[PDB]
Ligand binder design. Sequence first.
Ligand SMILES: CO[C@@H]1[C@@H](O)[C@@H](O)O[C@H](CO)[C@H]1O
Ligand SMILES: CO[C@@H]1[C@@H](O)[C@@H](O)O[C@H](CO)[C@H]1O
Ligand SMILES: CO[C@@H]1[C@@H](O)[C@@H](O)O[C@H](CO)[C@H]1O
Ligand SMILES: CO[C@@H]1[C@@H](O)[C@H](O)O[C@H](CO)[C@H]1O
Ligand SMILES: CO[C@@H]1[C@@H](O)[C@H](O)O[C@H](CO)[C@H]1O
Ligand SMILES: CO[C@@H]1[C@@H](O)[C@H](O)O[C@H](CO)[C@H]1O
Ligand SMILES: CO[C@@H]1[C@@H](O)[C@H](O)O[C@H](CO)[C@H]1O
Ligand SMILES: CO[C@@H]1[C@@H](O)[C@H](O)O[C@H](CO)[C@H]1O
Ligand SMILES: CO[C@@H]1[C@@H](O)[C@H](O)O[C@H](CO)[C@H]1O
Ligand SMILES: CO[C@@H]1[C@@H](O)[C@H](O)O[C@H](CO)[C@H]1O
Ligand SMILES: CO[C@@H]1[C@@H](O)[C@H](O)O[C@H](CO)[C@H]1O
Ligand SMILES: CO[C@@H]1[C@@H](O)[C@H](O)O[C@H](CO)[C@H]1O
Ligand SMILES: CO[C@@H]1[C@@H](O)[C@H](O)O[C@H](CO)[C@H]1O
Ligand SMILES: CO[C@@H]1[C@@H](O)[C@H](O)O[C@H](CO)[C@H]1O
Ligand SMILES: CO[C@@H]1[C@@H](O)[C@H](O)O[C@H](CO)[C@H]1O
Ligand code: NA
Ligand code: NA
Lengths: 343, 343
Amino acid sequence: IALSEIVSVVNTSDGRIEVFGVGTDNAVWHNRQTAPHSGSSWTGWISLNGKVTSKPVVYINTDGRLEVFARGTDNALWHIWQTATNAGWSNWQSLGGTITSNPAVYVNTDGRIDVFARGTDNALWHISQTAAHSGPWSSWQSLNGVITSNPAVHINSDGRLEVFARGTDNALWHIWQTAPDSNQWSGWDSLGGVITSDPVVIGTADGRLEVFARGSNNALYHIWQTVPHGGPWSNWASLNGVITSAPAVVKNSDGRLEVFARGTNNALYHIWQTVSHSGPWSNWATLNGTITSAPTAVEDADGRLEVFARGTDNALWNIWQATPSWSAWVSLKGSLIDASAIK
Amino acid sequence: AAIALSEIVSVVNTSDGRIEVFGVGTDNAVWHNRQTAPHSGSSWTGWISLNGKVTSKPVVYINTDGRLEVFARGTDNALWHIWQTATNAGWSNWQSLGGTITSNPAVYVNTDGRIDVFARGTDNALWHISQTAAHSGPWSSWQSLNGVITSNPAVHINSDGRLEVFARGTDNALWHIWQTAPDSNQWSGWDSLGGVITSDPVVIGTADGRLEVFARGSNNALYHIWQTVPHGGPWSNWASLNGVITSAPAVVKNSDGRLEVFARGTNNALYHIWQTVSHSGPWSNWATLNGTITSAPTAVEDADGRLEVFARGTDNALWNIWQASWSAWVSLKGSLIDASAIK
Ligand SMILES: CO[C@@H]1[C@@H](O)[C@@H](O)O[C@H](CO)[C@H]1O
Ligand SMILES: CO[C@@H]1[C@@H](O)[C@@H](O)O[C@H](CO)[C@H]1O
Ligand SMILES: CO[C@@H]1[C@@H](O)[C@@H](O)O[C@H](CO)[C@H]1O
Ligand SMILES: CO[C@@H]1[C@@H](O)[C@H](O)O[C@H](CO)[C@H]1O
Ligand SMILES: CO[C@@H]1[C@@H](O)[C@H](O)O[C@H](CO)[C@H]1O
Ligand SMILES: CO[C@@H]1[C@@H](O)[C@H](O)O[C@H](CO)[C@H]1O
Ligand SMILES: CO[C@@H]1[C@@H](O)[C@H](O)O[C@H](CO)[C@H]1O
Ligand SMILES: CO[C@@H]1[C@@H](O)[C@H](O)O[C@H](CO)[C@H]1O
Ligand SMILES: CO[C@@H]1[C@@H](O)[C@H](O)O[C@H](CO)[C@H]1O
Ligand SMILES: CO[C@@H]1[C@@H](O)[C@H](O)O[C@H](CO)[C@H]1O
Ligand SMILES: CO[C@@H]1[C@@H](O)[C@H](O)O[C@H](CO)[C@H]1O
Ligand SMILES: CO[C@@H]1[C@@H](O)[C@H](O)O[C@H](CO)[C@H]1O
Ligand SMILES: CO[C@@H]1[C@@H](O)[C@H](O)O[C@H](CO)[C@H]1O
Ligand SMILES: CO[C@@H]1[C@@H](O)[C@H](O)O[C@H](CO)[C@H]1O
Ligand SMILES: CO[C@@H]1[C@@H](O)[C@H](O)O[C@H](CO)[C@H]1O
Ligand code: NA
Ligand code: NA
């Protein structure tokens, strides 16, 4: 499993990027832009306390309230939420269970968050809100399977959640909701390949799921639905390169996909669709630096990509999509650890 | 009192990234036209009838499962609707939601996936009716939100999930009312935002999570007013953006968050005005886009991140221009009528 992303990132409801990581005290810390623009100053790192043993995973409820999910020291899923959009936070609360991966989080079309995690039996399990952006939560339910990566979730363009994970054969496997908002899922299906990172999944501008993962030769590979919210899936295709972290995928403001990963010189690299969201991929290009995590990418309120990665000083560093060339790297300070539950 | 010439179509971005437009043909049926490809300058399906007989502007909205749904007043003065049975698939029959309505419908979705529809009653109060479950029937009863209004209503969601409706009052000021909490059937009382408006209000959410309203004023200039705090008060003073506009204004965000407004001028050309530099920047001068139009423009961002504008032409066809120097005007053919229920 290629070096993990070390923060969870969200666009707040007021257009500010907020990042969540694990400090050297195993607490969750967060940092937010002071202004909704590229190159904004930051609040500085502020602790949400807790003691976690996974990557913390933020998700925005449909009412704009942020909510963070993490594995606790008792192996349960814990969460903490804003009591009002972009306002104060709750205490940490346990959702129980015994989990063995990072959480994977998405929201159903009815506003109910669904959380996925590997169990003690290596199966995929999930637990959900029973009302829009609200408790009470459901019981934990097994979706079976036997998985060997962190799971990744995204919604189809018809409202059906879908989960991706590496299997016992190191192939990519997936499972999907049969209908929006449903607790009834499909059987597991193999998409084959041999993957050497967690998978990441995104929705294309034209309503198809597309998955990226590192392959056996450390190249970047991808595979996609060929019909909106449906099959068949494509064959795997190589995007070449040699990468030494998990890949991070994001959509530009114009729909063009762009992928970030660490290279074999420990620098940040990227590759992008050219011309349009239907266009052919660029060559790989360096964004320099010396990074000690996978990168994390998000679009800011100015429509520009922003990238975060740990530096050799263990601070979080930032670089963004200025024109004609990307910005200088700038430090957000902090000291972050990789608490990913599967590495 | 005067209501500026209405938009001729309702527009939506489909779940597969294609612009779809809905208007009223010379037979009083609703017709739609869709891009064949999710790109600027795409060819179109051509106009296809959804039948019905309507006496309002038709209003499309996308359900949280991707299914389009159109709302319009019928020749019986009731609210009618028609929906896709699956995302971008076939349509239902038209079905009545009853009532007697005296405005165009205003439509939005709650944070729990329930569509909420607002219309003026024969008592000139604002009424509403909603889905009782996410993207699903049954529908609620018609319920009054009181007030006395003299324009078509406009609705948008706050950045904290609370719906908010805007309408002109008996005193020609802009008035508004808001949900007390997300998903609620409990609304505030009506509050005055003052001014003197000679159009329906047009409302948008800013890149930084504030509502902003545009309207024509008594001197036919474009005016706007905004929340000064995300999802809260106080509202700003009214500010003039000058011009002489002979239609309703159309407001949209660029891919970078910059607001941009389109309106017809005294020579019946299309004009526009935009924020410069960023979504926090000052406004440009008005500039012409030429053409000769017989409706207000309608503006939407396409899947390539470019603004697309539609307006009825001298030949009653729908004409298109897009943010390429802008493209040449091109005809999408058709023959449309202005069925707006308040003119
Ligand atoms: C979520 O963080 C902590 C959790 O891992 C566990 O140690 O229980 C604590 C409360 O007792 C939580 O604060
Ligand atoms: C999701 O957490 C647990 C799972 O890993 C397994 O140990 O079975 C338990 C139920 O018996 C679950 O609560
Ligand atoms: C869009 O505006 C005009 C249209 O209404 C029609 O008169 O045809 C002209 C081109 O011939 C266009 O400029
Ligand atoms: C206020 O709503 C929060 C909700 O966001 C959380 O998932 O679950 C909490 C308790 O389970 C709720 O109280
Ligand atoms: C995805 O979960 C497992 C997979 O890991 C195994 O290789 O193959 C199994 C099917 O026999 C799947 O259920
Ligand atoms: C994603 O799986 C790929 C496979 O598609 C390729 O043929 O062979 C690759 C070897 O690098 C595998 O890792
Ligand atoms: C129902 O649509 C599902 C789709 O969600 C999945 O990605 O791929 C499946 C085919 O492997 C499809 O049958
Ligand atoms: C076409 O735009 C690409 C952009 O997507 C990439 O981030 O950065 C490249 C170099 O600035 C640009 O050429
Ligand atoms: C998030 O990084 C924090 C930093 O903000 C704090 O000052 O010091 C902590 C201990 O070094 C760090 O883990
Ligand atoms: C929306 O069009 C409807 C039509 O579907 C219905 O049959 O008849 C109505 C008149 O009663 C029409 O207004
Ligand atoms: C399939 O869901 C549709 C819904 O979109 C419509 O609002 O209302 C219809 C009638 O209740 C529903 O059946
Ligand atoms: C919004 O509805 C009405 C308004 O039309 C009237 O001018 O003033 C009333 C209060 O005096 C409002 O409640
Ligand atoms: C509760 O927040 C509401 C806001 O939604 C409305 O726009 O403006 C009101 C003040 O006029 C606020 O009190
Ligand atoms: C700064 O971008 C603006 C654009 O928003 C407007 O559509 O058209 C203007 C003229 O092309 C541009 O200068
Ligand atoms: C939407 O415009 C339609 C057009 O497509 C049809 O051919 O002819 C109808 C009658 O002119 C028009 O109203
Ligand atoms: Na609130
Ligand atoms: Na004027």
